[PDB]
């Protein structure tokens, strides 16, 4: 098959979402130093090194442990954690439940709200019958850590780690429950302590990768890119694109339509390592080239630039074909 139909015009002009936050892609964020991503990320061999499927449903784990700090159980933070490698229900990988975010945990306590944490809505439930602990529903920060539960610290490797959920606001009544279940909707938001937007999230040094995840590095003047969408933040839940308190961008490694397609057919015979499958992105004044690697990473010929490329003036996408990564991808505004 030719992977050309994987990146059509609607994918980057309003319909396509990023494979991490499920937000409408509105920009291309180059990463001059490179990055890695495996969760909800597919390559051209039909495989992922991650633990999530190309869909945004619910995060669901049935065997963790829940607790609350302090001497009072009312309006208190609730902590849930489980060992990485215990998502027995997940057929893709037992590392983490399908949909668990690939971001290192940002520690916090008390009134302080974590900065740049993945946050989702849900709570704790009872593993023996499936009944919810109704007094534990809240917004929870989710992430990978070590030293849980005594002192969760951010980690970006999966083996030996722990997955952690902790409410950023006080739950109605906290519970101490062993073999506790976690249920959180897989569509997330970015935690902010106030109304200000922050830098794009997650930053490369916050992404958690499984053993064997290939990295995206520069090849000459070609630089790997992430796909930026406007993601909501807890500090100002109303803010969307062009807000007076700043525009919050979330970033993903692939357009979700590309991930879906890569996960249904095998494209091993379309590319060899050292080649991009190139599309030409045509704008109102000028054009640029997008290149896709066998590892499922996208590149651009922007060199050391980290300025975000706005897509609001993109007109159409035309496939080009395989091209050598020795050639600098064209970039003409």
């Amino acid at each position: 098959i030719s992977p050309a139909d994987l990146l059509t015009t609607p994918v980057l002009t309003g319909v396509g979402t990023d494979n991490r936050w499920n937000g409408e892609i509105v920009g291309l964020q180059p990463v001059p130093g490179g990055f890695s991503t495996c969760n909800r990320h597919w390559n051209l061999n039909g495989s992922t090194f991650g633990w999530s499927s190309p869909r945004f449903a619910a995060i669901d784990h049935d065997r963790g442990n829940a607790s609350y700090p302090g001497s009072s159980s009312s309006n208190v933070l609730e902590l849930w954690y489980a060992s990485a490698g215990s998502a027995a229900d997940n057929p893709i990988s037992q590392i983490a439940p399908d949909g668990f975010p690939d971001m290192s945990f940002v520690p916090f306590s008390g009134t302080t709200v974590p900065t740049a944490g993945w946050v989702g809505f849900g709570g704790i439930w009872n593993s023996s019958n499936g009944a919810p602990f109704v007094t534990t529903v809240q917004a929870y920060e989710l992430g990978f850590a070590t030293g849980a539960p005594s002192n969760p610290q951010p980690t970006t490797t999966t083996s030996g780690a722990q997955i952690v959920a902790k409410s950023i606001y006080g739950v109605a009544t906290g519970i101490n429950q062993a073999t506790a279940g976690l249920f959180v909707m897989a569509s997330g938001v970015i935690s902010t302590p106030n109304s200000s937007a922050i830098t794009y999230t997650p930053q490369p040094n916050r992404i958690v990768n499984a053993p064997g995840t290939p990295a995206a590095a520069p090849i000459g003047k070609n630089t790997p890119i992430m796909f930026a969408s406007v993601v909501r933040r807890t500090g100002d839940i109303n803010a969307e694109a062009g807000s007076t308190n700043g525009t919050q961008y979330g970033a993903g490694s692939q357009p979700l339509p590309v991930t879906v397609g890569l996960s249904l057919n095998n494209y091993s015979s379309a590319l060899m390592p050292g080649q991009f499958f190139v599309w030409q992105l045509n704008f109102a004044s000028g054009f640029m080239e997008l290149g896709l690697s066998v590892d499922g990473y996208f590149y651009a010929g922007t060199g050391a630039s980290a300025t975000l490329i706005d897509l609001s003036e993109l007109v159409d996408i035309r496939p080009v074909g395989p091209r050598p990564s020795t050639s600098t991808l064209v970039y003409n505004l």
Partner: antibody
Amino acid sequence: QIQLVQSGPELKKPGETVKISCKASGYTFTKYGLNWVRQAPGKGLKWMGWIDTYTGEPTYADDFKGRFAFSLETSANTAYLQINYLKDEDMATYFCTRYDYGEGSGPQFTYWGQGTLVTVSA
Amino acid sequence: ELVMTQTPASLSVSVGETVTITCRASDNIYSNLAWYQQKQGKSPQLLVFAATNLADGVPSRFSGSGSGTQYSLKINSLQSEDFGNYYCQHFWGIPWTFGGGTKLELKR
């Protein structure tokens, strides 16, 4: 050398208050949680709780929520346990221990202080 | 909730004997079980973690095994340095609980 050095023995009366020190060295104090375990003379070890050394947030076993309080002084690489309104049932050796879980290790109490014996008598 | 029951309370052994002590949990702890050794007048030292792994620096003669609710600690050919008290402890929901302890005394 990694070590946890605890404060000296205390001898107090019923109802009085005691504060025990546990000072770490040889590692980053705020990256590893400290748990408190107690042992009455001749009996076994009872777990009390942990204090998150990065945030200061303490978690207690339910039996210890009333009169026990964990604190820390980050600048001094030191954790504190304070017991108010001492009972006879508080007479024990108190251990601070460093919690580890990750990178192939744990969950485990890896390093232990030398203990602090609180004698309660009138 | 999970209470720990160690067995036996004490046994008298000679150097060179192989010894098995047992820790049983009141519900499943999913191998989140550590073994500690405490010598008279000292602070405990870590022996096994996650049921079956020797801590850094623990001699090869110590052996941990188990799953679900029944766990055991085996000491092949007890050297003179092995006498003292032994505790199991679970990390499955607070309160984390220690067993009652097995005392290995010297035979004669």
